[PDB]
Amino acid sequence: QIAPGQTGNIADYNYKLPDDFTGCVIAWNSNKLDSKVSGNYNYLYRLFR
Amino acid sequence: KLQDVVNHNAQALNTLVKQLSSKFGAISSVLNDIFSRLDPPEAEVQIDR
């Protein structure tokens, strides 16, 4: 969903890239330090702006 | 010839104004639809065409 110019809840409400963006994107899942049996609720997001 | 010159000029102007409606194999023939109905990164090619 996150991309230069793409619309969405994160784009409209969180870190949004500009139309003319140059760089590289790296993605990977790290359950080593993010998996909590009770829930790793500290990773928060905003959905009302 | 006096009629011919004026007729040629009128025909040239009419052709020039008529060729505006051509889409040139693009999404639409007006700028607002291109700018509002598509992502700008992939609308740049259409507007440039």
Side-chain angles (χ1 to χ4, degrees), chain B:
Chain B
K1 278 75 69 178
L2 311 185
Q3 303 305 114
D4 299 333
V5 170
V6 189
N7 292 347
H8 269 186
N9 308 318
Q11 283 327 99
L13 279 185
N14 202 47
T15 300
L16 177 54
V17 64
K18 182 266 290 181
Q19 213 167 4
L20 182 60
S21 72
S22 161
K23 281 154 50 63
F24 291 79
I27 299 314
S28 180
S29 71
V30 298
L31 271 299
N32 288 319
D33 295 348
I34 306 301
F35 279 129
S36 68
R37 283 182 55 247
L38 279 172
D39 56 355
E42 309 294 2
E44 294 294 328
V45 57
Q46 313 297 118
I47 184 183
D48 294 333
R49 184 176 298 111

Side-chain angles (χ1 to χ4, degrees), chain A:
Chain A
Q1 177 173 173
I2 187 167
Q6 284 194 0
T7 181
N9 58 0
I10 176 168
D12 200 276
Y13 277 10
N14 305 108
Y15 170 78
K16 181 182 188 296
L17 278 172
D19 314 285
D20 182 64
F21 171 68
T22 303
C24 290
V25 178
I26 300 97
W28 57 300
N29 47 353
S30 80
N31 283 283
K32 197 83 67 180
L33 318 174
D34 296 344
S35 167
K36 259 72 177 178
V37 287
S38 294
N40 190 80
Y41 285 87
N42 48 14
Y43 292 169
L44 187 150
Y45 73 98
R46 185 163 61 199
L47 211 57
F48 282 104
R49 186 172 165 80

